[PDB]
Write a protein that binds this ligand. Structure first.
Ligand SMILES: [Mg+2]
Ligand SMILES: [Mg+2]
Ligand SMILES: [Mg+2]
Ligand SMILES: [Mg+2]
Ligand SMILES: [Mg+2]
Ligand SMILES: [Zn+2]
Lengths: 56, 193, 50, 102
RNA sequence: CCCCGAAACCCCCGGGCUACACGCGCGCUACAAUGGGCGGGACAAUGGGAUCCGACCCCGAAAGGGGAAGGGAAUCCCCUAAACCCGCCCCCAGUUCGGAUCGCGGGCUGCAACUCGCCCGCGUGAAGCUGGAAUCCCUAGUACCCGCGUGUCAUCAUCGCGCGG
RNA sequence: UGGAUUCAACGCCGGGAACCUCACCGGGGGCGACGGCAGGAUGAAGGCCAGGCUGAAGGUCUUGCCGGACACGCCGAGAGGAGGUGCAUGGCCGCCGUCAGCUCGUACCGUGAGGCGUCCACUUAAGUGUGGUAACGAGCGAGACCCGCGCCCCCAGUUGCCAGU
């Protein structure tokens, strides 16, 4: 078994694969408006804990 | 670094800390934390209900914990200390977790819920509501609300005054959701004395 | 595992190496032979007999 | 005499007011000339998520909001004043920044 | 819970999700004069900005290119909006309406632009001349009309959320 | 590739997919923690020089290569699974519906299930109120509450404004 390991975690720099939620790890609907990186779901779950309020 | 960036960063970091500790100190009635970046270092304070459990065996736990803190999360010099909840029976996430812990021990849900309600309303809450939702009483799931006292649901006074807590009880056959809501002895608008 | 690689030949009171050597590398580096060139075991890089 | 700008920002008007009152009362404890807490436009970070995971059903949105209140205070730069405004408590949910105009 | 479990796990290349005889939903552009073009004249707000906004200068027909002040945000920039008005051509017609399609060339992003991106210039010049049955939205700064911002975003907005006129 | 099919699917899954995203297709390569089993490091678990295959690959390989070091070649037992099950669940969402409903304590009525209140008439956006009434009171919900806009006053005057001098 003389070989070479080939998982190759490729470092994307732009793309839906480049960005990943820091909580769940989802790749698409990620919030990045003011330095966030969060899936819309997670954000809706935790926004109060961050201080976001729902007065409208 | 803009200022809103700073606020966002602090909130997100603290939220992830809170998540981790919620996972790891659920036996301890982990109510929450607070964090201050003093010059000599960042000192944090864990509000929980069993500091005995969070310290473990002569500071073992806080030690590996602070290691995790400075490593996995950007922190200058962690200075963990510990404190209690002044009235945990008025806190509601600690109670939700205690109830989930009970249901996992195997206590029947009506008994556990009514025990917790009795405890809270003797420890002095104006109102309490408890929803248990899931595979209770067989394979088809249902929801049961146990309530006592006086509890508001809607409005800013609800969003502010009542304390909400949620927990999962991971049992053999699946999850039981535990929602708890506690209204302490404090007043609303239409009182008008 | 090739699993047996005694290459030195004992001349008697001293060994003589079956190996060749690479000039642009350091000491101890031992080489192979592929019909016109050498091979570095330490790192591996271009080389030929010439 | 060269001046000192103090830009301070928070999410709590009351902590903000506490700090400004600290500064007012300390300047008048001394006699250095304050320039008022000029209130700057407050930042409304708005995030309009859809509140549904399923993608099914009517589309409904959560408009979450974070508010950052901002004040600036100009006070003449003295070593005394500077030492003590450094000594200020500056609670946890507040940022400050002491620039100096010279 | 069941299953895969060295494959139904992980990674890479390429393709596909972008195929099209057709039916449907929501919309954009129009079928012109209650207008089209050309040249001139005016008037916003909301929001956003670090490898990010980029004034200002120069180059270029354009798209765009080089350098670059200031700006971590009531300081700088995005940002002198369009509908509107004035003058001149067109004078009721498949037209100076309409811009499907296609050819040639020139560019930007990106590791990569064929499949399969966006932009510019010359050229082409498709149906369509107001729409049955039936149906939708709306009660005041509302509807209609006009454009703008932002989210998505390496580049891509006939979209979403919002802004004003 | 899938999900969703009247209202409440069909510019929805923030779904504007060149790679990623991806779950589809063609091909290529890695993965057994813990134990034990075949063994064992003897110089290798693992990486690896030039090439042939290969789309391209120390992936593999005749030919050779050593920096100093254990075991899928075999079992269980797994890690991970955007694999199935949303009629196994939680959480969230939509719809009924920002509708005006849902109930309680005591009393009374009824053998009882239950009823009354919670009905009637006006009124209101509203079980909102007025009055009548075996009902009297109360609670959740509605309202109160919170956010913003619009007029005035006070404070404050920078990075904002510029009338007056
Ligand atoms: Mg034309
Ligand atoms: Mg005509
Ligand atoms: Mg869209
Ligand atoms: Mg009723
Ligand atoms: Mg209300
Ligand atoms: Zn997430």
């Amino acid at each position: 078994m003389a070989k070479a390991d080939y998982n190759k975690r490729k470092p994307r720099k732009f793309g839906k694969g480049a960005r990943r939620c820091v909580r769940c790890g989802q790749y698409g609907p990620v919030i990045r408006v003011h330095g966030l990186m969060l899936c819309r779901h997670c954000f809706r779950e935790i926004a109060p804990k961050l201080g976001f309020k729902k007065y409208e | 670094m803009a200022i809103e960036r700073y606020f966002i960063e602090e909130g997100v970091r603290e939220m992830l800390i809170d998540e981790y500790l919620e996972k790891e100190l659920r036996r301890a009635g982990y109510s929450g934390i607070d964090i201050k970046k003093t010059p000599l270092g960042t000192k944090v304070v864990i509000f929980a209900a069993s500091p005995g459990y969070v310290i473990g065996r002569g500071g073992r736990r806080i030690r590996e914990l602070t290691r995790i803190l400075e490593r996995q999360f950007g922190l200058e010099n962690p200075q963990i200390e510990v404190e209690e909840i002044k009235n945990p029976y008025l806190n509601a996430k600690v109670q939700a977790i205690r109830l989930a812990r009970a249901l996992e021990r195997g206590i029947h849900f009506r008994r556990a819920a009514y025990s917790a309600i009795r405890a809270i309303m003797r420890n002095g809450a104006r109102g309490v509501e408890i929803r248990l939702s899931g595979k209770l009483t067989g394979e088809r799931a249902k929801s049961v609300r146990f309530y006592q006292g006086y509890l508001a649901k809607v409005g800013n006074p609800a969003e502010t005054l009542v304390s909400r807590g949620y927990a999962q009880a991971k049992l053999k056959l699946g999850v039981i959701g535990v929602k708890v809501s506690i209204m302490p002895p404090d007043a609303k608008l239409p009182d008008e004395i | 595992m090739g699993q047996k690689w005694k290459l030195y030949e004992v001349k008697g009171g001293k060994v003589r190496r079956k190996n060749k050597f690479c000039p642009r590398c350091g000491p101890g580096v031992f080489m192979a032979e592929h019909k016109d060139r050498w091979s570095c075991g330490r790192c591996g890089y271009t080389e030929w007999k010439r | 005499m060269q001046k000192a700008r103090i830009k301070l920002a928070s999410t709590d008007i009351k902590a903000l007011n506490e700090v400004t009152d600290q500064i007012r009362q300390i300047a008048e404890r001394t006699g250095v000339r304050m320039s008022g807490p000029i209130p700057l436009p407050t930042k409304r970070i708005r995030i309009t998520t859809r509140k549904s995971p399923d993608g099914e059903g009517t589309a409904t949105f959560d408009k979450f909001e974070l508010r950052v209140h901002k004040r600036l205070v100009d006070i003449e730069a003295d070593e005394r004043a500077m030492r003590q405004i450094m000594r200020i408590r500056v609670p946890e949910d507040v940022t400050i920044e002491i620039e100096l105009i010279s």
